[PDB]
Design a protein around this ligand. Structure first.
Ligand SMILES: [Cl-]
Ligand SMILES: [Cl-]
Ligand SMILES: [Zn+2]
Ligand SMILES: [Zn+2]
Ligand SMILES: [Zn+2]
Ligand SMILES: [Zn+2]
Lengths: 267, 267
């Protein structure tokens, strides 16, 4: 209906088999923790494909549909270079080239997505950009205590990677939700308390826009913020929206997420 | 969750005041009929802005969020030309230039949107493209019995336009839903009956793809269809997917809509 929200979490992930390093899987899900557990099932109930390491996830999608299409393109879409080139290949290099293609050279560039690595070696192969996909505007993060050059010579090695990788995926998922919860609760507090006017149109406010900095005093109509942001390359989405009060670089999709969510939760 | 659907209907509309021809309003809604009625309220409970004629609607959006952003950009986004130019102006020409900008020159081009006119004079001013926004890939339709050059010299004139415009908006809305319902029911019938294999991978099928032509026999995994479609300019969305069985030009977003919906309704 007219109250559908941007998902709290929706990501597109790459799995790499811990023992079979040239085996990959691309999927998408609103709960990576649960999904990775299904993917691995039980190692006791076998060719060694399982267990999988989730090595990277792209998240922040405005909906399931847009995540599905990122997934489709990742799996079977074409690479580009700053024009179109060869279809996505088999190696880790090709899998990671497609990410760069989609985020940097494709319309996805405008969605303020986050690319997160759970494996540092996979992060560096990506940063490498072997095929020179690109010579902003997404986020790249790497897990604290990310895995480095994986050992898989032994059973204990393999079970260790699996185990640490779970913890790492769990930490990103729970922190993200918790950070969203905290930020939401403080925006609600701001609305329930003050009778604040929009910074721009000065009319007592129905969708809201706040700063990321939850102690900052910037508040406005969502459509007013957009107008200001489009005023001071971008034609239809503000790609580097600085807050007019603190100048912290905002993510416009983030601002919409809380706007939509705060509106939804009320009703 | 993982069962969110592409909306049965979600559109971005332009209103033009019947009496005040230079007054416009841009909005978006999953139910244009209900929304237009709210916009007009009652003419008995006044400056003559009301009643509004809904002159055009863009629909087919994958979600509320994407419709919201089309709306934002329409209202306050920049025009382009085949580079960026002047911000959207006040005239009917400028309002309609922004549509062309968004559909033809912007990422929206890939969403298989439909631009529908309820007013033929507004359609022709749009087709005119006074500012030469563009020298595929959306649909343009015009209401059967669309209004031509509006009379608003009198009360009866004005109430007549209002009245006919309602009927016209109602006919597009109800037909669209009914056409979607019919097409869905026949795809369900196809699944409940046959034990069909995918046309491409030959494995007995979890998302489906069918032809628009509901009597056509093409069926496949959604991801398989996408792969085929990306094989035979487009880098990540198949812009002219011809069915492999009948060669009718498909809309990929339409195919996803029924795919997602058929999957959703089952569970
Ligand atoms: Cl296995
Ligand atoms: Cl009025
Ligand atoms: Zn305002
Ligand atoms: Zn601030
Ligand atoms: Zn198949
Ligand atoms: Zn066919």
């Amino acid at each position: 209906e007219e109250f559908q929200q941007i998902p709290d979490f929706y990501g597109c992930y790459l799995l790499q088999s811990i023992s079979k390093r040239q085996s990959f899987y691309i999927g998408s899900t609103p709960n990576p923790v649960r999904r990775l557990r299904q993917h691995n099932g039980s190692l006791s109930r076998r060719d060694g494909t399982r267990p999988w390491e989730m090595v990277a996830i792209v998240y922040g999608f405005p909906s399931r549909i847009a995540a599905l299409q990122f997934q489709h393109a990742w799996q079977h879409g074409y690479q580009t270079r700053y024009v179109k080139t060869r279809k996505g290949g088999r190696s880790i290099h090709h899998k990671l080239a497609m990410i760069t293609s989609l985020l940097k050279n494709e319309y996805f560039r405008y969605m303020d997505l986050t690319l997160h690595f759970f494996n540092q070696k996979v992060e560096e192969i990506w940063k490498n950009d072997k095929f020179n996909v690109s010579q902003n505007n997404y986020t790249v993060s790497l897990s604290q205590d990310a895995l480095t050059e994986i050992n898989n010579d032994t059973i204990d090695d393999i079970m260790d990677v699996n185990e640490k990788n779970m913890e790492l995926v769990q930490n990103l998922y729970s922190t993200t939700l918790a950070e969203k919860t905290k930020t939401l609760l403080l925006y609600k507090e701001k609305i329930d308390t003050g009778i604040n006017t929009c910074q721009f149109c000065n009319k007592i406010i129905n969708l809201f826009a706040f700063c990321r900095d939850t102690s900052c005093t910037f508040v406005s109509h969502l459509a007013c913020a957009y107008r200001y942001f489009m005023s001071n390359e971008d034609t239809i989405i503000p790609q580097s929206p600085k807050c007019p009060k603190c100048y912290t670089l905002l993510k416009w999709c983030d601002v919409i997420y809380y706007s939509i969510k705060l509106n939804k939760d009320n009703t």
